[PDB]
Design a binder for this molecule. Structure first.
Ligand code: ALF
Ligand SMILES: [Mg+2]
Length: 209
């Protein structure tokens, strides 16, 4: 029983939604933020700068509204069944995201994931301050996290799998044993071993040892 590890990106992969675009709707800036999110996922913008820019537009948004947005996030088709089978096949399952703990940790709890890494929205007096902080901002951040988790678990990098859809998943792919682009952007598909174009996470299972 050689241990294995699979890491999932969150927005548009493990869940249907883009967390930040949902929150942007509550702040009345959905269109503006969605445009930046798309450019960042296409690899046209630096991730950290793009995230800080989007989060500044959310300044003063009440936490009550952030929560309403988060309540709308739903797991991607086949997420539960895929996670179950992955655990049956002996995998440690993790979610690594450039999104936010308040949304990611809910799903980590709901789906029973082993690890969850995300950034943090800063709040004061019940409202967003417009700032974000975290360790999933730099270009190489996700790759470093994959290595960190694998090291803790004593899992060889060759026995790791990464599933993602955007440009900030590139460093995660770089360190992964098997790279799966799930209904992904061109910049990521070019770096993938396997490209899945049907939106059902169960489609990755046929490729998993
Ligand atoms: F959850 Al992501 F880029 F979609 F970190
Ligand atoms: Mg994504």
């Amino acid at each position: 029983k050689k241990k294995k590890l699979i890491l999932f990106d969150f927005d548009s992969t493990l869940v249907n939604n883009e967390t930040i675009d949902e929150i942007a709707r509550e702040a009345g800036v959905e269109e503006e933020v969605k445009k930046i999110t798309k450019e960042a996922m296409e690899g046209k913008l630096n991730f950290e700068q793009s995230l800080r820019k989007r989060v500044s537009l959310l300044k003063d948004l009440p936490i009550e509204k952030v929560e309403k947005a988060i309540k709308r996030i739903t797991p991607t088709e086949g997420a539960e069944e895929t996670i179950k089978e992955l655990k049956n096949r002996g995998y440690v399952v993790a979610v690594v995201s450039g999104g936010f703990d308040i949304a990611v940790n809910k799903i980590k709890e709901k789906l029973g994931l082993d690890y969850a890494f995300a950034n943090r929205l800063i709040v004061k007096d019940g409202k967003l301050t417009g700032d974000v902080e975290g360790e999933v901002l730099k270009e190489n951040a996700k790759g470093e996290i994959l290595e960190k988790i694998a090291k803790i678990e004593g899992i060889n990098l060759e026995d790791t799998v990464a599933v993602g859809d955007g440009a900030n998943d590139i460093s995660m792919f770089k360190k992964a044993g098997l790279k799966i682009a799930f209904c992904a952007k061109p910049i990521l598909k070019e770096k993938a071993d396997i490209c899945i174009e049907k939106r059902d996470l169960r489609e990755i299972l046929k490729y998993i040892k």
